[PDB]
C-alpha cells in the first residue's frame, strides 16, 4: 500500500461558507484513506507532492415561495487548504444559482470540481459550502477526495 489517495463520503475561520465536517472514511468499497488521514473534516497530507483534489456537493431542496424575497440561492463549493500560514487559502470555487422562476417546486444541484495543487506534508484540505442546510449527505452524492499525481 505505497498508494497515496483518499475518497471520503457524506454521512447522515476567515474561510467563506461553512466547513463540511461529517465525512465517512472507511466503508470498504465505498470510501477509504491510503496514506492520508482525516481530522475535523480535513484531509491531512503525509507525502509532499502534486495532488489532484476533487469534491462533489449535492444541493437538494424542496422550496416554498419566499413571500417578500426572491427564491434565489447561491450554491457555492469552496476547496481550501491550511498550510504554514494563519489563514486558510482558497484553492478552488464552483458556483451555481438556483432557478429564478417562482413556479419552482424543487432544486437538484450537484456541484463537482477538481484540480492539481502542490501540497506540503501536514497541509490540511477541506470543503466549505454556502447553504449547508440544503446539502444532501448521501454517500454517492457528496464526497471529497485526492490522489498523488506527482
Amino acid at each position: 500500500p505505497q498508494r497515496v489517495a483518499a475518497h471520503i463520503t457524506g454521512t447522515r475561520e476567515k474561510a467563506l461558507g461553512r466547513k463540511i465536517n461529517s465525512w465517512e472514511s472507511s466503508r470498504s468499497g465505498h470510501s477509504f484513506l491510503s496514506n492520508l488521514h482525516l481530522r475535523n473534516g480535513e484531509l491531512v497530507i503525509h507525502e509532499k507532492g502534486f495532488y489532484y483534489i476533487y469534491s462533489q456537493t449535492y444541493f437538494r431542496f424542496q422550496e416554498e415561495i419566499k413571500e417578500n424575497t426572491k427564491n434565489d440561492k447561491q450554491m457555492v463549493q469552496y476547496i481550501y487548504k491550511y498550510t504554514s500560514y494563519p489563514d486558510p487559502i482558497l484553492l478552488m470555487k464552483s458556483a451555481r444559482n438556483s432557478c429564478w422562476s417562482k413556479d419552482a417546486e424543487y432544486g437538484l444541484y450537484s456541484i463537482y470540481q477538481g484540480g492539481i495543487f502542490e501540497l506540503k506534508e501536514n497541509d490540511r484540505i477541506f470543503v466549505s459550502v454556502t447553504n449547508e442546510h440544503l446539502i444532501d449527505m448521501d454517500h454517492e452524492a457528496s464526497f471529497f477526495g485526492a490522489f498523488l499525481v506527482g
Binding site: 447522515r12 466503508r27 470498504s28 465505498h30 424542496q62 424543487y106 448521501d138
Partner: protein, 98 residues
Amino acid sequence: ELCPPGSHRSERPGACNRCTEGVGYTNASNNLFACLPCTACKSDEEERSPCTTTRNTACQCKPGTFRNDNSAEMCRKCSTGCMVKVKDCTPWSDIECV
C-alpha cells in the same frame, strides 16, 4: 461458502461480521468486505419500514406527490387536471388521462 444476509466477510477467509442495525445491511448471501449503507428517507418522503441488517429502508412519497422511473430524485406534485381522468395518482404514478 457465503456470508448470510445481515453479515459481510472479514479479513480471515472463513469469518463473517454482522452489519450494524440502522447503519448498514446486506440482502443476500455474499463475500463483501463491508455492508451496504442504509438509505435515508428525504423530507418529501415518509418511511414505510426502517433499515434492518437485512433490508434497506423503504420510502414512499408523501400524499399528493409521486415518483417514477424518470423522476427518481424528488417527489413531484400530482397533476390537478388533464381528456378525462381515467386513473387517480399513486405514490408511484401521476394521474392517468383518457
